[PDB]
Each structure stands twice: as structure tokens, then as C-alpha cells.
Design a protein around this ligand. Structure first.
Ligand SMILES: CC(=O)N[C@H]1[C@H]([C@H](O)[C@H](O)CO)OC(C(=O)O)=C[C@@H]1NC(=N)N
Ligand SMILES: CC(=O)N[C@H]1[C@H]([C@H](O)[C@H](O)CO)OC(C(=O)O)=C[C@@H]1NC(=N)N
Ligand SMILES: CC(=O)N[C@H]1[C@H]([C@H](O)[C@H](O)CO)OC(C(=O)O)=C[C@@H]1NC(=N)N
Ligand SMILES: CC(=O)N[C@H]1[C@H]([C@H](O)[C@H](O)CO)OC(C(=O)O)=C[C@@H]1NC(=N)N
Ligand SMILES: *[C@@H]1O[C@H](CO)[C@@H](O)[C@H](O)[C@H]1NC(C)=O
Ligand SMILES: *[C@@H]1O[C@H](CO)[C@@H](O)[C@H](O)[C@H]1NC(C)=O
Ligand SMILES: *[C@@H]1O[C@H](CO)[C@@H](O)[C@H](O)[C@H]1NC(C)=O
Ligand SMILES: *[C@@H]1O[C@H](CO)[C@@H](O)[C@H](O)[C@H]1NC(C)=O
Ligand SMILES: [Ca+2]
Ligand SMILES: [Ca+2]
Ligand SMILES: [Ca+2]
Ligand SMILES: [Ca+2]
Lengths: 389, 389, 389, 389
């Protein structure tokens, strides 16, 4: 009936699943209406996985596709594609207008959520199946926004992290608890709770959820939020590892002080992601990604650890380079593929494609999952934005 | 088994669901065969919602798409798209030839209905699943025509409003009662019954239906038709509110006389729409739309009331502007999304796009549903018809 | 379980269902890969109807589409589209290579059949679901060929009419009886059996089938074949009505002699069609089509009769003109839409489109079904082949 | 429940099913995004058959499609199409990145497998439904590679042949045994086991599998591998027939020595295929293909035999020419269509299309299945690569 976390399929590394690269098909002579997009993620039911993303109400090639750099507009929508369908106009399914999104399947129906509206009075609407069942208005009136990756559903309840407030200062996250799309509860995040954008969330055992977030203002360490679904509580932490996962970031281990010390830099950031191995009682291994560059959104390197990331300052263990340092790599996202016997967690990579500042912008999506013993291959796009018609 | 009205999901305002905007993809360089269309509406089964519309047997760009301004021809068909699919040639499904349409799902099968034929001897055909099960010929031999929005099915019977007669004079509506597409009964509309085109209809409780119509000849007040499905009767009224909902219209409250007094103007009009909150016994709130302009089809403003619209001349309560006054806005339509626990009513807006008189004509469709506490955002198209190839 | 004929939904005329017109989308500026085709027909399961046709392994516009006039080649295939999908490359489903075809659903699985091979040694292959279960080689080694419309399945057995032999002389038809695609029996057609191409077949009651065919060599009267599925016998007749249904044809009633007298002309012909009303015991009304012109394939006129067409020379009763005489109209085909409570028979019209002799050739398909009391409207294409890119 | 081999539908020859030819639609004026590809094959579940192939992350026409000659890159993916859908961008479904592939359905879920990674450290990943359940790293670190045709699933276990090692020397094949995508066992191939690439495999009775392979280094005779699924053993043989099936090859019967003697030539080769008739206990007839030319990959000729191909040096019996000798014909592949009453085996032909060395490269796929008594027709492409835009 209801979705719930199982023990994960055994795996000791990350290996490539597939890649979607729609703008390979937007060159001279081509015959495709491709969908430029940003903030992609993947979410799955027991029947099918789907690639979700935020579009701009336009295809490429096309005269209007110059707006695709914008973060927020009346044009953007949360859309999705069956996973493995290329990202073309006829394959696209529109779910909700809005410019920040999340989605997750509870075992019976999809929940889709987007934020729509002006910056100072936006509203999250939650769609359950075909009906808008939930509505959650901005509480700090400064760009209400959510995960840009899948939410987590356990035992008929879904858990969504939202944040509202300045990009350059304190902004308090909230855990929304939904039931058939209705917001039935808000959970206050205690502990280290002054930031936490764009969380990538995965269940760590049968009843707990762990989210890896972005602190855009205070620290190059990523915030971590843990949710106890039985107690209905949430606590924020700062990831303690010397291997800082945000971009931009200082040299590894150079932040002086306790685990929860911000550091002197910390402005700016990017959505990050992780994967894991777990039994029904505990997570036994974690897998992390960060950029190759400590200053630009370029490259992707995988790491792993068997320590608790909220307690240990130990450096992470290098897995290898999944995207070379010369290749733009922007957001990454966590997701889980449910199975009848075991679950599997994965990391998707937003390989960015752009003609430049305030010009055409989109991506290619590469997917790696927890399986095997060594990284198999790195990913490239072989798309030159200059070649896009 | 059979569809029947449930209590609606709680909601105190209208908030945006999604928007379809196919002709964003018909610009120079684009690679899409988009479907120009008019009189769109949405109807849902428990499985899926669908966007229905009347096409012209052509795509845009294309050499033949200059006929898309015509109301009636041998080219038009009732077609549909899964809701959320963009309106392209490969996504389209053709149901019936004809130039006035409606459709509704009874819980087991779709009923589709169109009027086909010459102006003076048209015929409504009703398709149930894959078979044409019903046929209803013109009774006044002057453009038989129907709702251009979904019909209402209760307990295995579907209710369709048709009208026949002059656009500028008395034309008597009829309620057709269908069972598996067969017209089993005609219900005579008593009361105020001299006009009533293009009705948008919703169940007001377990057994009654209310339709909001267009009087093209006599009044800027909209006619309202109520159907008692148990008694098998229908009665027409004139909406009494000072906030007149048709276009063109005089200043609010300036019509002198009783609730049912026409007023001195009243020629012309446009299809209108409403939404509601209801329990199984009674409607508890109504939501209305009208244009911003009192003379042109431009803009869309939402209103609400807890009064009976056939009894109260009280002004409606402003919700806010859903489409700015500088933006063409033509038809609007009511529809209902059925759910397993509650139903939800919505209003769709036909945001018109045209190069001018007897030139290319189509639209974008924005959808708002009853949910939340304040209007979230207004809608735009950002399509300039001059840019369409 | 198994498909079997029910009493037909009540109806006293033919009225338009829909029309497919893919080459409206093949004009300058258009963005569609349309499928040029000939010999279309429709066949239905209880789930969906499908438009079948014979393609040429090409789309229009395209450099190779000049071969679309050919009757037989290694390029042609039996393909199909969900009924209501427009005839584009991405909507097409390929079933079998070959240049003469038929298909019918027995209640459990589709049977598809085509003839493939050279003129002097062609082979019919029969596909049941996904497997080729049947094979029937040419028996006269002179263009084995079949109905170009749906076969008829009763009680798990399907009935297919095939013919082999000269187009200008005696060619003996055979009734093939199939079970899960395997040819289990050949039925010898007795009586008037020297011709009978391209039969359109419908059940006339619970256990009998009637086929309306084309005599390409001897007569402007159409041959009729009746099959008794219980006895497993078939007998050929000549339609006796003064209203001769083939093209070309002499003036009505001018053939002198008995019902089975050929007449002095009779060379050439075209596939024809009929529809009917029936109970479980007997057919009570028949509906026929023929061209407007007695010499060219142009126009379509509907007729009806309550007489036995193998016994009565009475003229048929005019219903009206479904396609005007200035409009090319080639093949027509019979088909039946099964229902849970009643069945419905229909006639489809191949409205031909061509640039001329040995040039680009395709069609538009208009569908009329037995319902109502008067013909609703005639059909046009509004496609000028000169405009096709 | 689980898939297992049944007796095959009776048939004594090979006859054409269908052909897919997407690049007929890539000519001047055409409107299709076609998918250039190589190493196609077909695999079926009880619900549907699917055409699998290895793409290049590009469509034709398009600026990037010049890489389509490459064997291995970071661009290639195992993709599939419902069998009968033409090979266009919107019809394509991406399963796994990689440049050597196989897939097979066990009765419950699809298993997909590809090899990804650099030549010296590639990794096979196995996807079961939506999850990557298996991982198998290169064991000789010299281009791990697999069948390029469907694997065989019996009683919940699937059997995949892999090889690793030099293309010009000894390379040891391994039989991988999978259960829900997990590699549970490796079976050592005994006997003649120094080569065996690109095996086409079919069950020969209820419990045994026979694979027809390519020896790229030692012999023009094809290796044959038999798997006993009950004992869990595999043994390699050399096909003994004087009618040598590989290309290039010496004159028939001119290899001097025993059945297992290599011969003095033997360098180079091509993937080959066979089909069969079987009961639940034994194979009763085998059908083989080879090229017309003994030196180039051109043409296709069918043969048959009732002898054991590992024991008899008897020449095979000619069936006839399926593709004329002037037409390029590259890989061929075995596959089986499961049925409820009987199974059917088939051979697909990769009819190659290329502009030349290190230029655009793709194919057309023709399918022949075991049915009937004589070959019905040969196949052509009528695609001139010079005409491709
Ligand atoms: C709601 C919103 O606009 N979110 C922004 C996000 C945001 O600016 C930062 O996290 C600071 O708050 O940054 C960026 C980014 O690329 O850094 C993309 C996101 N765009 C979208 N999700 N449409
Ligand atoms: C059957 C028919 O032609 N209905 C007309 C409708 C009609 O003219 C008026 O209501 C007056 O009767 O007006 C208009 C309109 O835009 O005002 C569109 C509709 N077009 C279509 N439904 N095709
Ligand atoms: C097998 C075959 O070629 N059948 C022909 C058919 C035939 O020539 C006549 O009936 C005389 O035998 O005529 C014509 C026609 O338009 O008259 C189309 C059919 N074309 C196809 N079914 N491909
Ligand atoms: C893994 C790999 O590259 N396999 C090659 C294959 C291989 O080179 C030979 O068998 C020698 O080992 O040959 C060829 C070929 O056309 O001969 C295509 C295959 N290409 C692909 N399967 N992508
Ligand atoms: C999951 O982990 C948390 C934190 O360690 C623990 O409190 C909880 O009991 C665990 N749940 C189960 C079902 O073991
Ligand atoms: C619905 O409302 C009508 C009008 O007020 C009323 O007559 C009828 O009884 C109501 N139906 C139910 C089931 O309460
Ligand atoms: C169908 O009609 C035929 C011919 O009139 C007749 O012989 C047969 O009995 C009828 N079948 C049934 C079931 O009535
Ligand atoms: C299948 O054939 C093999 C080899 O001849 C034989 O050993 C085995 O017993 C056969 N299986 C069955 C089920 O007959
Ligand atoms: Ca930061
Ligand atoms: Ca009015
Ligand atoms: Ca004739
Ligand atoms: Ca060799």
C-alpha cells in the first residue's frame, strides 16, 4: 500500500545509469522541439520513474528561448517526462505553474508542489493526483522556495522542506507534512536552523529522513536536517567533514573551530546531493558529490564515508571524478528508486549548458546509482552552446 | 461506479493550477506543429483530466491556418489532449466532427457531443465510448449549439444544455438527459427562459445542477439555469447581483428594476464561468469571473459571494485580477475534478491570440481552482501574434 | 470472452462521426511528418478502434514520396493508428510488410493479415498478437489479394475473403477460416463465384456474414457473398438492385436479364461498402454507398433498402449526397464498432488526393455511422495537392 | 509466472514479418528526427515486443550525427522502441548508457544490460525494471562486451554471454546467470572456448540454450555454445557444416581437418543468427543466415538443416536469398516471440546504410520468422545515403 523505506540493494560505489541530453538535437538541420530547462530532478513510483524539471513555456530552437536564464517568471512550470524519454515538446507533461518545485509518490498518488506568485507574496500549491489539495502561503514574504528535488513519503505522509527569507541572510526552513496533498502539520527545525535551501532528502532507515542542503549565506559546509517521522521533530546540523561540499569553498579543513562553526567566507552556494546504503535500522555508508573547482560550478567528484556526517570532521574518501573539471556542472539531486525487494539511491547531475550571462540556459542530466565497487566512467555532454540554433 | 457529486475540498479563493500555451512554440526557427483552436474546456474522469477544444483541421505554422477565425465549417472537430500535454499535432485526439461541443464522463465511459451540419439543419451527435449512440436534430433550424464546456453526469445520467434560434432574439434552451449517449428525455426550462447560450454547469449538491449562461440579446446579467435531477425539472433565472458578469455591460448596479429586469442594453455577450464550495446538501460559496473591461473581451477579475445569485442584488466581493486589463481574455469555463475523498471546482480562461479580424485566431488556457485564501498570481501569455510564423 | 454479433444500436440513417485529414498539415511552413497512404480501413476491439492503412515507408513532405501511387512494392506495410490520432510518423504502428491487408479482433487478440511477395508467388501471412501464426500461399499465382477492410470474427473464428487470378477475368474467391491466426479451413464459395475482390463484410445476425464485393471484369452489379458460420458454407450472389453500386456503371436499371445477368459492360470497378441494422436473427435495413459519377471515382451518395439485395431488383431509396460530385472519392469500407449493449455499423470513405498519374497519392478518411433519421452534412477535404510540399 | 520455453509454432521456412526503415524519413523536405543506430535487436515480453539498439545521442538530420560510425564512446546508450514504432526521437526510450548491450524479459520484469567505461576497465551494469541491480567488471581489461541480441530467461534466471580480451586473439567467454538483475553465478565455458563474440541465443528445449557466435580471430566456422540450465554448465563447439556462416570465409567445405579445426584463414567476422523449430524435449530443425558475399558484408541467404550442427559436416539446405548481394547487410540477430500456446523464433537483419569510412552510419531492420513452407520475398531499403540531409 503506502510507500516506506526498505533496506537498500547492496552496493559500494556509484556507477552510471543513463544520461539525457536533449539539446544534442537542437543543431542546424535538426527536426526536434527540445525543452530548455533548469533545476531537474527525478522521482519514482513503483510503476515508473519520471524526470521532473522547471521549464520556460518554450522550446529550442525558437524565438522566445532567450528567457531561459531567468529564475522566476510567469512562464515557468513544473513539467515531467517518463524517465528515458528525451526532453521534447511532445513527451512533456505539465503539472503546475511555478518556479520552485518538488514531487514525490506516496504509493498511491503523486504529490506535486510548486511555488507561484510574486517574490513578496508567493504561494506553494500542492497537487495530489489531479486536484490541488494543499496551499501554503509565504511566511517571510521573501521568495518562498523549496527543494528542487523529490520529497520523501513514508506511511502515507510526505515531507517537504521549504524556506523563506533573504538569500544573503538568515532564512528559517520548515518541514511541511502532507497527507493527500493537504498540509497537515508544520515541523519546526531546531538546532542549527538559520539556513538550508534546496535540500536533497533521503530516508536513512525505516522512520528517519536526512536532508543535505545549501547555506547560501554563512558557510561552505552544507547544512544537514534530520527528521524523525515518529516523533514528528526535525533538527538542523552543519556537516562537519573537512571535505566541504559547497561551491564556492575554502581549502579543505581550513575552517577553524567546532563542527558547527560557519567559517569566515560562506557566501553563495549550489544545490548538492548524496546517496547512501541503509538497512531498516541505520545508514551504513554515505556517498557525496561536490564540484572539482572550489570557486566555480565545474566538474563533479564523488566521495564516500561510513562516519556520521554531523559528528566527524574526518575527510571523506575519494571515489573519483564523475565529470571533468573543464565541464560545467551545476545542481545535483538525490533520489530513490523503490523496488519490491530492495530500494536504491542515486545522484543526478545537472550538466549546465549556456551561451552566457542572461542568454540561453539549459542542461544535460547524468545519473549515477549506488552499485558495484568502482566508478565506471565519467560523463560529458559534447554539446557546444554556440551550435544551438 | 457511477459518478456523483461529493462535498468539495475546502478552499476560500482561486489559485493558479497550470497554463497551456502551445503557440509559444510557433515562432521562427521552432520545430512544432501546434494546434490553433477556440472554445477550449476541460473535463475529467477519475483517471485523467483532458483538455477539449474545437480545432480547424490544421496546424500552425501552416498554409491553411488562416481559416482559424471561423465559427462554423466542415473542417472543425471536437478534439482533446491529456491535461498537461501541450497542444501539438501528435498529442491530439479527434472525437467528432462539428463546431459546437461538450463532453463529460459518467464514471464508466466518456460522452462526447458536437453539433455538425449547415446552420439551418444541424444535428447533435452523441458518442459514448467509441459508438455514436445519440442523435438530436435542430428544433428551431437556426444554429443548434451547446455549452462549449463539460456537461454534468449524476448517477448514470448526463445533462447537456442546448439552444437553437436567433443570436439576436429569443432562443429557447433545452436540457437533454442522456444515458450511455442516448437522449432519453428533454427537460423544458421554465421561468426566465428566452435565452441562455454556452452554459457553464456545476452540481450544487448531491442532486441539483446550476448553469451560468450567456444572454446574447437581452441583458448584461447572466441567465442561471437550475436542474433538479430527482424531479427532472429545470428553471431559468437571471443573476441579480449588481456586479454584472457579461461583456459588454453597463456600470454596476445601473440596471433599474427587479432582479429579472433585462435592462436597456444587453446585446452581445461572451461565455462566462463560475466555481463553488458545496457540501452534499448545499452550495456554501460561489466564485465568479468577468472581464476587466466593460466593453471589450479583455482582462479577468475574480469575485465571490455567499448569497444566492438568483435572489440577491448585493455586489459581489472582489478577489482580484487574474488577467490584466491589457490582455485579451475571451471565453471562460467551469469544470470539476473528481476525487476519491472530495471534489474540486475550477475556472479555465481562454486567453485569446489573434492577428485581427478574419485572420489567424487561437488561445492560451490558464486554469484556476478553488483552494487557499488569496489569489496567488495573475496570468500572461507573452505571445505576440505578429511573431507566429 | 469471444466477440460475437449483437443487435445493432437503433438508427435509420447515416450521420458523420469524424474525419482524418493528415495532409492538411503538409503545406509550406508546416512542421509535420504526415503518412501518405491508400486502402485505409477501420477495425475495433472492445477497448479501442484503430485506423489501418497501407503505407509506402515514407512521409510527406519528403524526397521519396513520389512512389505513393504504386499498388505493390517491397516498401508497403500494413500500419495502424489509434482512431482519432492524426496520421503522422510518430503515431504510426507497423504490423506487417505487404501490399494487401485486413485485420480484425476476436475478443482476445488482433489478427493482422497481409499479402507479401512477387505478383506470381505472393504469400498471405497472418499475425495473431505478436506472432506470425498463419501462412497461406498464392493458389492461382496471379496477385493473391484480400479485402482492404476488416475481417469478421465470430466465436473465436475469423473469416477472411481472399482472391487470386486475373484482374480482367475469372478469379475465384475463397473464405479462409482462422483460429488464433492459423488457417484452419478454406470454405469454397459456391453459386455466382467468378469474381469478388475487396469485400466489405458485416455480420447479418448471430451466425451469418454478408460481404459486398467488386467484380472487376464482368459486371457493374456488385457481387455479394454470404457465409453461414454454423454450417461452414459460403455462396456468391449478384446484387440485383437497379441501383448499380460499382463505378464505372451503365444507367440504373438498364442491364437486361435476370438478377444474375452480368450486363454487356462491367470492366473495371472500385471497392464498395455498406452498413446495416440487425437483430440477433435478421438484418432489417441496409445502407449503401456509390459514387456520384457513373464513370469516374468522384462523389459519394448514400442509399438504403429493407429488401433482400440478392432477390429484389427494386431501386434503392436515396438518403443523400455525402461527398459532392466534384470531389474525388475512391474506396469505401464497412466496419463495426462493438459495444457492451449494442453494436454499430459504419461506412468510411477514402477521399482521394493526388497530383496525377504516377505522382503523389494519398487520401482523407471520412466516417459515417448508422444513427439518427437524416443525413447531417456532406464532407470535403479542402486540400489542394498542388499545395503539398 | 516465470518465462520458460514452449514448443514452437509449426513452420518449415522463413517468411517476412515487417521492416523498420527510419531514414526513409531523413531526406530533403522531411520533418522527422530519425535515430541513427547500430547493433539493433528485438526482445519480447508476453505483452509487447521491443526493438532495442545502441544510439549515439543524436538524431538525423543534425549537425552532430557524423559520429555514428564509432563503436564506443560516452555518447552511446541502449535505447528501445515498441516494435512497429518507427525509430524517431519521440518514440525512443533510453535504458542505460553504454556501447554493448543485451536485454530480456523473465516473465515479470525487463533485464537490461550494457557495458560502459573505457576500453581497459569497462563495467557491465544490469538494470532490473527501474533499478541497477547488477554490476560485473571487466575481467581481462580489454573491451568487455556482450551479445548485441537478447539474452535468454528460463524459470526466473537469465543467461547472458560476455567476452573480454583481444579482438585478434584468444578471448574467453563467460555465461553470466542473473536473478532480478543480480549476477548470482558465472558459468565457465568448457570445450572449444577460445573465442565467441556477439552470441545469438535461443532455447533448444525446456532446459537447454544454444548460442551461435562470432570467432573474430581463428575461424570462418561459427562457435556454438550450449548451456544446460539444470546442471549449470556450458560447453563450446565449432559449427561443423561445410556451409561456413561467417564473413569473410573461404569456399564451402575447403577447410581441411576435423569438425573443430580452425582453418588457415579466419580473421575478422560478423555477428550471425539462427532460428529453430523445437518441441519441449528437442530441436527438430535449424534455420541459418549468412551473407551472399564470402568477403564483404553484403546480401543475406537463408539455409536450414535437421542435423546437429556440432556433429555433422553436411552442407546446409538452401532456402533462398532474403537480401540481394548488391545490398549491404551487416549484423543479424536471433529472437523469440513468446505466446500463450506456442513460441516462435525469428531472425532480424541489420541492413546497413553508410556514407563511408568514418562517416554517417545506421541501418534498416528487416524481420523474418519461422512459418510457412517457402521464402516469400527478399528485402530492400531504397535508401541512398547520399540523399540523407
Ligand atoms: C526560487 C529561486 O529563484 N531559486 C534559485 C536559487 C536561489 O536564488 C538561491 O538559492 C538563493 O536563494 O539559485 C539558483 C542558482 O542557480 O544558484 C536557481 C534557483 N532558481 C529556481 N529554483 N527557479
Ligand atoms: C455555434 C457558434 O457559432 N457559436 C459561436 C458563438 C455564437 O455566435 C454566439 O453565442 C451567438 O449565438 O459566438 C462566438 C463568440 O466568440 O462570441 C463563438 C462561438 N463559435 C463556436 N462555438 N464555433
Ligand atoms: C493487390 C492490388 O494491387 N490491389 C489493387 C486493386 C487491383 O488492382 C484491382 O482490384 C484489380 O485486381 O486496384 C486498386 C484500385 O485503386 O483500383 C488498388 C489496389 N491496390 C492495393 N490493394 N495495394
Ligand atoms: C564492443 C565493440 O566495440 N563491439 C564491436 C565489434 C568488435 O569490434 C568486434 O567484435 C571485435 O571484438 O565489431 C563491430 C563490427 O561491426 O564488426 C561492432 C561492434 N560495436 C559495438 N558493439 N558498439
Ligand atoms: C532510525 O534512526 C534513528 C536515529 O538513529 C533512531 O532513533 C530510530 O530508532 C531508527 N528507526 C528504526 C526503525 O530503527
Ligand atoms: C439540493 O438543493 C436543492 C435546492 O436547495 C434541494 O431542493 C435538494 O433537496 C438538495 N439535495 C439534497 C440531496 O440535499
Ligand atoms: C441468420 O440468418 C440466416 C439466413 O437467413 C439463418 O439461416 C440463420 O438461422 C440466422 N441465424 C440465427 C441465429 O437466427
Ligand atoms: C534438452 O536437451 C538436452 C540435450 O539433448 C537434454 O540433455 C535434456 O534432457 C533436454 N531437456 C528436456 C527437458 O528434455
Ligand atoms: Ca555556502
Ligand atoms: Ca448580453
Ligand atoms: Ca465492375
Ligand atoms: Ca571469423
Amino acid at each position: 500500500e503506502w510507500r516506506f523505506p526498505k533496506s537498500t540493494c547492496p552496493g559500494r560505489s556509484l556507477q552510471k545509469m543513463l544520461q539525457l541530453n536533449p539539446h544534442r538535437h537542437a543543431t542546424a538541420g535538426s527536426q526536434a522541439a527540445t525543452i530548455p530547462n533548469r533545476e531537474p530532478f527525478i522521482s519514482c513510483s513503483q510503476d515508473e520513474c519520471r524526470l521532473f524539471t522547471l521549464d520556460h513555456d518554450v522550446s529550442t530552437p525558437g524565438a522566445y528561448d532567450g528567457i531561459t536564464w531567468e529564475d522566476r517568471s510567469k512562464r515557468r512550470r513544473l513539467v515531467s517526462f517518463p524517465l528515458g524519454s528525451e526532453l521534447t515538446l511532445d513527451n512533456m507533461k505539465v503539472h503546475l505553474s511555478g518556479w520552485s518545485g518538488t514531487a514525490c509518490h506516496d504509493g498511491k498518488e503523486w504529490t506535486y508542489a510548486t511555488v507561484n506568485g510574486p517574490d513578496n507574496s508567493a504561494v506553494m500549491r500542492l497537487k495530489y493526483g489531479d486536484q490541488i489539495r494543499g496551499s501554503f502561503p509565504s511566511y517571510a514574504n521573501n521568495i518562498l522556495r523549496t527543494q528542487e528535488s523529490e520529497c520523501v513519503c513514508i506511511d502515507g505522509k510526505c515531507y517537504i522542506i521549504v524556506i523563506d527569507g533573504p538569500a544573503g541572510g538568515t532564512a528559517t526552513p520548515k518541514v511541511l507534512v502532507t497527507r493527500e496533498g493537504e498540509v497537515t502539520s508544520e515541523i519546526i527545525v531546531t538546532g542549527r536552523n538559520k539556513m538550508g535551501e534546496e535540500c536533497s532528502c533521503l530516508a536513512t532507515n525505516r522512520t528517519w529522513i536526512e536532508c543535505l542542503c545549501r547555506d547560501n549565506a554563512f558557510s561552505a559546509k552544507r547544512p544537514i536536517i534530520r527528521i524523525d517521522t515518529v516523533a514528528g521533530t526535525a533538527r538542523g546540523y552543519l556537516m562537519c567533514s573537512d571535505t566541504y561540499l559547497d561551491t564556492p569553498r575554502p581549502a579543505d579543513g581550513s575552517i577553524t573551530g567546532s563542527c558547527e562553526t560557519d567559517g569566515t567566507s560562506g557566501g553563495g552556494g549550489v544545490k548538492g546531493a548524496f546517496a547512501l546504503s541503509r538497512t531498516t535500522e541505520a545508514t551504513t555508508e554515505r556517498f557525496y558529490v561536490r564540484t572539482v573547482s572550489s570557486s566555480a560550478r565545474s566538474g563533479a567528484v564523488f566521495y564516500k564515508t561510513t562516519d556520521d556526517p554531523t559528528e566527524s570532521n574526518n575527510p571523506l574518501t575519494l571515489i573519483g571524478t564523475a565529470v571533468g573539471g573543464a565541464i560545467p556542472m551545476w545542481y545535483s539531486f538525490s533520489f530513490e528508486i523503490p523496488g519490491k525487494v530492495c530500494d536504491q539511491t542515486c545522484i543526478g547531475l545537472e550538466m549546465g549548458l549556456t551561451m552566457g550571462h542572461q542568454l540561453w540556459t539549459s542542461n544535460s542530466v547524468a545519473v549515477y546509482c549506488v552499485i558495484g565497487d568502482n566508478l565506471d566512467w565519467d560523463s560529458t555532454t559534447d554539446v557546444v552552446p554556440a551550435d544551438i540554433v
